[model samples]
Target: MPRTASPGNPKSSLSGFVNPQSGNPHAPQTNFANMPSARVTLPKSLVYDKTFSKVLWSAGLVASKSEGQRIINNNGAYVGSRPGVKKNEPGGGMPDDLTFTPIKTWNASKTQEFIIDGDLLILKLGKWKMKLVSIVSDEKFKELGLTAPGWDEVVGKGKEEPSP
Candidate 1:
């Protein structure tokens, strides 16, 4: 737990973007450097069939989805797919290929592999991580019909629904 003092950004980048300050203290930074990459999009079956609790709620890493399946059954979690800027490359965008396993041996063809290979599809736990990009352009996943509620539907703690 002491990766010796950067220890991490357990959320609270506050959409203001400044998570970097000289990289990799054991990787995973850049929540798209805070926000607005034309306001994010996720579809294409949650980005090319990615899973392990749906990219752990698309890399918010876990504020729910059973707290990312109890941090993927207590081995914390990780996924990596680095490289960017292509052939004329210089400074690999971020994600240095994280890859941690043991979410029940990650089957289902290796836990829905292909983390968008070649440009930031990194997701990690126990030291904050985010940076993902994908769009097969279906009007960019329909403008913003997002849904992922629970944490008992955002803190009211569910269990009512008996109205017939």
Candidate 2:
């Protein structure tokens, strides 16, 4: 299978004051773009400890900055066969699945609607939705700190960070 041409390379951006869950993409887009710079207060353990890391808040853009948002927001997939690619097969980066779903997208501008096909997950921003192309598995999610569902520490029980 050949890689399906997607809208663009992945990038992250923000729009001010857009709700993460809104049909009106602009509401979410504005919220995200104009997110407050104020820090989230956390317990000393979470703030000081190395394990409880901060999640970088930004919308995953489809295309890179060089290309306009059009390139980034189009639906598509990465091409290639890398080990541990979830639901992807040999020869290409396209997922075995090819279902299109309507979702809101944000990319530093007014939220414009976009459709997510295959491995993409679209999140709403303001009046639009942006695509998140990285099809992260539960394991990958754990690795990325998006979830801690089924992961065991490789370093040690207490030490969350692995040794170099």
* Cα lDDT tens digits for candidate 2, 1-164: 24776665554443445355555554555443444222222222121111101101222432333332223344322111112325533323223233222212333211111111112322222223322323223343446764353344542344555442
Off by over 4 Å in 2: 1-96, 102-126, 138-157, 160-164
TM-score of candidate 2 on Cα atoms, chains taken together: 0.20
Evaluated against the true structure, the overall lDDT of model 1 is 0.45
- lDDT per residue for candidate 1 within 16-78, as digits (tens), equals 665666764434554445431222234434455544555556544344466665666676565
Error of 1 at 61 (Å): 14
**Prediction 2 global C-alpha lDDT:** 0.29
Stretches of candidate 1 exceeding 4 Å from the true structure = 1-54, 57-64, 67-69, 72-75, 82-85, 88-137, 140-164
The alpha-carbon deviation from the true structure for residue 141 of candidate 1, after best TM-score superposition, in angstroms, is 8.4
Residue 97, candidate 1: alpha-carbon lDDT: 45
